[PDB]
Design a protein around this ligand. Structure first.
Ligand SMILES: [Hg+2]
Ligand SMILES: [Hg+2]
Ligand SMILES: [Hg+2]
Ligand SMILES: [Hg+2]
Ligand SMILES: [Hg+2]
Ligand SMILES: [Hg+2]
Length: 1182
């Protein structure tokens, strides 16, 4: 079912090219061993010449002619063969790559449109359940994975098995024993991979749990940053994060060490197998004469067949993970379970004037177990009326409105519009006959003309005009620039909410429904605009049967009929007077209410500087890189010598020669290889480990010691910072790894390859390095062109995805239903551009890889043609021919190196650039000295003079302009302003979060500028709006060590005693030792505030600061907390900016701050006796 068959579905003509491409992938994979079968045949003919050169030379003139004639024949075979295979792999590569794009393109585009349709066709279900909107984005990433699954990855898979099965085929066919030997040594290679699976996979996960502790500490500190800053508890958070880092690093070292050990054993088994393969390959020639040394290399090509399984595994994982992600959700992704709504058919009533009927309706939202919110209902409103509903116990009114649009089919009973059931009539038509003005208006990002046009697609500006005129929306739009062509700026949030709703009214007005549903449309709006929108609603009524729910009973007064519920069942119904008459529910309520990142700057060799500072010395790492570096070419020399004594050499000692080279190849390569992998792993493992620690430490610490809009007003976030701390330090660990990688391959290829090249017949080196770097560049340009396509594709789907996410995230598109098909139609038109683009990139993806494989034969071409033949005949021996393989494999060796181990620099360098720019910091105000703390400074009189300030946004209309205040010690400084900030900013400047732009601020009369940054924050009573405690024992929270300040039990006792939180301290288990229970989820606001107050008065500040402390709070809690504050303050300087003017009535100096400039100031009775702003504030506060 869904696992295999369904995944590939449809694609009638697609499947044909799918199979053609598959076939070309097969013959492509087949091509590689055939090129290597040729290699054994070419070796034999090439071999026979050397035998006469060493031994006989009986006749001379004959050999210079005939042997080379034979060589020329081999030149002819060389030429038609490498070429035949080359043209083959060129064509078939272009085809097999054409497979992804051509098949997957149509498959995925079909998936895309069907997915978008099923998504819009599930209706209610999507908003009720699943991941609540955030899911289908991820899902379009899933269809992107689908795109990755059915692509050429499969073609590569068949190619791989073709090289595998075909490799072993040729192996068995031209001899059967060595294949068998290699297969016997083969499972050993699979066992070594077992070290990988147990240790490596586990230790990644092991280390993560360790740093998880470090992440939690870093998570909260950076979120609680202004609090820890204000209290200066930084160095302690420093300490915790350092301990957790200390554990995470030791799990890091075990990971690196073991990893390198594993890869090391892998190479052991590789050189071991390679050698044993030579021992049995050699045993078949000298004392036997089966192989002439032809097949011996081809049987190694059977090892290329062994590499083909390793090349196969990722493609399967690419198919499976794409398959698995798609098919499990594909049944849910696609089709249409639906059938409570759908889109189509049904019954069309044309009578269009009717009576709504609710009959015995029992319903529960499909949250299931929730008790029926509506259990039974009977309500019937005659045509032309306006019915108003009210309730107490909750939901159940909104439910009836929800049911009326058939958003939910009732469990029992029926809703009948006119005489017909609602379930008979067409859903689309039903939605079209029912207009709805919701409590929360919504405007799509488009013109107001289009937002209306979403009400009805086919419409003209005359109807738009009459619409807004009828919605009285024709005023603000005219004054608004661009008129009807006026965009809704910054997505859909631009203008007044009353205007938004009013526009929504015009939109529903174009709909011209005979039923109008108003759910709290007036709610959450200012009273004036409330009355305006209300007027629009009133002009929209009486021509339409309607139902209105709101919490302002003034609008409920003029309703023809009002309905009470209390538990979901209808109880009272009738005219207003009748309801007040009943002294019921209505009368009861009436009387009751009376991660964008990455700046340009780059490291430039500065990485190794921080490394060397934290990497004290390691010459053993680089030395290990040298001996492994020189280890690879030893192989190329040895291998040359193996076949070397077979071609050029005499009959005696050949057996011994093979034994010696076998053993030399085994221990000299394999053992030393184990040594170097375990040694470097032992070096760079601890190197990168401690680098990751010291880096993460000095980062989190460089971060905590700087604030200044990195925290106060950042474009950053807590998560981005934690991410910085983890990932980046891991990357600089790779940055350090690349150094050793570079010196290693430096001596490994260039140095030894060149030195060895000096002993050549010359001439070969130049031609060889005229190839390898070029094909290397071809490998670079392949990845680059690849990323260019990835980016352009992602940008196109980006735009289509943006407008798609716009559709799916807004569920109200269903209330008009006009936009159901309209949105996916436009989106279809959006998806159209990349589709046509796909065939073009089909050729792009297609021709490139073909050309890449076109370099396969050309490498072998220039190699053996010019290598053998013409270079041969003078100064050419058993070496320098196989040394071709040396310098060639050396280039490939580097490839192996670059495409493995540490990250491809890049991200490492960049992450390093950030982690470095962060550790450099911008210390500004940090700790240092800056003052002496005269004992006599305990006064507390805060001066402000000519102070201007702006948060770091220049044209933000700065909150401080020309501001000056004063407060004497031991007295209350009241503060009042319009709302929000400029209130708080004074407090922040006193906290010295930022030193003001101009003017000055004083505490004892000294300038804050000249005051100690720390000691200024040493006496402050700062208590914020929403108090946040360090996660710790509440006793330990109460006492925050400033510097040397010890945890004092009797002191924190005095703290609780003063804060009146001692109530909870007395009771509850452990008393003071009760922890807050995961960020104080067990405590209410009054308690948290009491504790925060205790945090303040432990410090014994001469200055207390309250920023709208009781603003968010309620009932008695405000009084007991205010009482605590009052017993804490008035003995010392305090500033209360709270918006509560009833408790501000007792103050020494009340200050009204307008626009940066203090307007009025004086005691309550003084300003109140006066008249102006303050008097307005109290009069409207009442
Ligand atoms: Hg593709
Ligand atoms: Hg509910
Ligand atoms: Hg090494
Ligand atoms: Hg602000
Ligand atoms: Hg804590
Ligand atoms: Hg106060």
């Amino acid at each position: 079912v869904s696992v295999l068959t369904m995944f590939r579905y449809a694609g009638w003509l697609d499947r044909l090219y799918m199979l053609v491409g598959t076939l070309a992938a097969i013959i492509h994979g087949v091509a590689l061993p055939l090129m290597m079968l040729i290699f054994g045949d070419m070796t034999d003919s090439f071999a026979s010449v050397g035998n006469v050169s060493k031994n006989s030379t009986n006749m001379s003139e004959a050999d210079k002619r005939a042997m080379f004639a034979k060589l020329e024949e081999e030149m002819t075979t060389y030429a038609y063969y490498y070429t035949g295979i080359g043209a083959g792999v060129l064509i078939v590569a272009y085809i097999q790559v054409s497979f992804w794009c051509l098949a997957a393109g149509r498959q995925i585009h079909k998936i895309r449109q069907k997915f978008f349709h099923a998504i819009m066709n599930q209706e209610i279900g999507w908003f009720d359940v699943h991941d609540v909107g955030e899911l289908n984005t991820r899902l379009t990433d899933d269809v992107s994975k689908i795109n990755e699954g059915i692509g050429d990855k499969i073609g590569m898979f068949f190619q791989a098995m073709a090289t595998f099965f075909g490799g072993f085929i040729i192996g068995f066919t031209r001899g059967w024993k060595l294949t068998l030997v290699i297969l016997a040594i083969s499972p050993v290679l699979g066992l070594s991979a077992g070290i990988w699976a147990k240790i490596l996979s586990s230790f990644t996960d092991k280390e993560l749990h360790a740093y998880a502790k470090a992440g939690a500490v870093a998570e909260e500190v950076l979120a609680a940053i202004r609090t820890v800053i204000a209290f200066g508890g930084q160095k302690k958070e420093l300490e915790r994060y350092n301990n957790n880092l200390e554990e995470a690093k030791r799990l890091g070292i075990k990971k690196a060490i073991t990893a390198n050990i594993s890869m090391g054993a892998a190479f052991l088994l590789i050189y071991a197998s390679y050698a044993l393969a030579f021992w049995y390959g050699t045993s078949l020639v000298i004392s036997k004469e089966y192989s002439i040394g032809q097949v011996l290399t081809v049987f190694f090509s059977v090892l290329i067949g062994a590499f083909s399984v390793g090349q196969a595994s990722p493609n399967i994982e690419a198919f499976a993970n794409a398959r698995g992600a798609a098919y499990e959700v594909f049944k849910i992704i696609d089709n249409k379970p639906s059938i409570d709504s759908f889109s189509k058919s049904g019954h069309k009533p044309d009578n269009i004037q009717g009576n709504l009927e609710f009959k015995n309706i029992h319903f529960s939202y499909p949250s299931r177990k929730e008790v029926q919110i509506l259990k039974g209902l009977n309500l019937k409103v005659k045509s032309g009326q306006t019915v108003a509903l009210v309730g107490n116990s909750g939901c159940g009114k909104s439910t009836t409105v929800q049911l009326m649009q058939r958003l939910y089919d009732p469990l029992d009973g029926m809703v009948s519009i006119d005489g017909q059931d609602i379930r008979t009539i067409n859903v689309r038509y039903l939605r079209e006959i029912i207009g709805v003005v919701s409590q929360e208006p919504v405007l799509f990002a488009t013109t107001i003309a289009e937002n209306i046009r979403y009400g009805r697609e086919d419409v003209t500006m005359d109807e738009i005009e009459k619409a807004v005129k009828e919605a009285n929306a024709y005023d603000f739009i005219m004054k608004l620039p661009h008129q009807f062509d006026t965009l809704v700026g910054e997505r859909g949030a631009q203008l007044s909410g009353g205007q938004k709703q009013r526009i929504a009214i015009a939109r529903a007005l174009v709909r011209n429904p005979k039923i109008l549903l108003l759910d709290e449309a007036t709610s959450a709006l200012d009273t004036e605009s409330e009355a305006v929108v209300q007027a629009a609603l009133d002009k929209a009524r009486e021509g339409r049967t309607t139902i209105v729910i709101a919490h302002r009973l003034s609008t409920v007064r003029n309703a023809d009929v009002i309905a009470g519920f209390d538990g979901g069942v209808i109880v009272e119904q009738g005219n207003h007077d009748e309801l007040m008459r009943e002294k019921g529910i209505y009368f009861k309520l009436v009387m009751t209410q009376t991660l964008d990142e990455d700046v340009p700057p780059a490291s430039f060799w500065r990485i190794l500087k921080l490394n060397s500072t934290e990497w004290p010395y390691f010459v053993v790492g680089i030395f290990c890189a040298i001996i492994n570096g020189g280890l690879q070419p030893a192989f190329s020399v040895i291998f040359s010598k193996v076949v070397g004594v077979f071609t050029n050499g005499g009959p005696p000692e050949t057996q011994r020669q093979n034994s010696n080279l076998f053993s030399l190849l085994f221990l000299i390569l394999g053992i030393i290889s184990f040594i170097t992998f375990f040694l470097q792993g032992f070096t760079f493992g601890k190197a990168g480990e401690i680098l990751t620690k010291r880096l993460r430490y000095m980062v989190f610490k460089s971060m905590l010691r700087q604030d200044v809009s990195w925290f106060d007003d950042p474009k950053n976030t807590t998560g981005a910072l934690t991410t910085r701390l983890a990932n980046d330090a891991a990357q600089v660990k790779g940055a350090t790894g690349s150094r050793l990688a570079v010196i290693f391959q430096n001596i490994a290829n260039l140095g030894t390859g060149i030195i060895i090249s000096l002993i050549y017949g010359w001439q070969l080196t130049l031609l060889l390095l005229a190839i390898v770097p070029i094909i290397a560049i071809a490998g670079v340009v392949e990845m680059k062109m690849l990323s260019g396509q990835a980016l352009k594709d992602k940008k196109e789907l980006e735009g289509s995805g943006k407008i798609a996410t716009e559709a799916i995230e807004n569920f109200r598109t269903v209330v008009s239903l006009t936009r159901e098909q309209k949105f996916e139609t436009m989106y279809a038109q959006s998806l159209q551009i990349p589709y046509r683009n796909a065939m073009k990139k089909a050729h792009v993806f297609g021709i490139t890889f073909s050309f890449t494989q076109a370099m396969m034969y050309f490498s072998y071409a220039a190699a053996f043609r010019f290598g053998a033949y013409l270079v041969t005949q003078q100064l050419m021996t058993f070496e320098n021919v196989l040394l071709v393989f040396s310098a060639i494999v050396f280039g490939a060796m580097a490839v192996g190196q670059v495409s493995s181990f540490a990250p491809d620099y890049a991200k490492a360098t960049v992450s390093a650039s950030h982690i470095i720019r962060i550790i450099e910091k911008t210390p500004e105000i940090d700790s240092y000295s800056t003052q002496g703390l005269k004992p006599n400074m305990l006064e507390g009189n805060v001066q402000f003079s000519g102070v201007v300030f702006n948060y770091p946004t220049r044209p933000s209309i700065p909150v401080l302009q020309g501001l000056s205040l004063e407060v004497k010690k031991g007295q209350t400084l009241a503060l009042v302003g319009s709302s929000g900030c400029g209130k708080s900013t004074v407090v922040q400047l006193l906290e010295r979060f930022y030193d003001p732009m101009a003017g000055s601020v004083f505490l004892d009369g000294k300038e804050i500028k000249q005051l100690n940054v720390q000691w200024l924050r040493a006496q402050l009573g700062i208590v914020s709006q929403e108090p946040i405690l360090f996660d710790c024992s509440i006793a330990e929270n109460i006492a925050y060590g400033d510097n040397s300040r010890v945890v004092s039990y009797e002191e924190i006792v005095r703290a609780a005693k003063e804060a009146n939180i001692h109530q909870f301290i007395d009771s509850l288990p452990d008393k003071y030792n009760t922890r807050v229970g995961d960020k104080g989820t067990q405590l209410s606001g009054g308690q948290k505030q009491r504790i925060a107050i205790a945090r303040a008065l432990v410090r014994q500040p001469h200055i207390l600061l309250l920023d709208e402390a009781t603003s968010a709070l309620d009932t008695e809690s405000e009084k007991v907390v205010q009482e605590a504050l009052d017993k804490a303050r008035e003995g010392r300087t305090c500033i209360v900016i709270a918006h509560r003017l009833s408790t501000i009535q007792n103050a020494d100096l009340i200050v009204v701050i307008q626009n940066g400039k203090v307007k009025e100031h004086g005691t309550h009775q003084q300003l109140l006796a006066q008249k102006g702003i303050y008097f307005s504030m109290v009069s409207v506060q009442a």
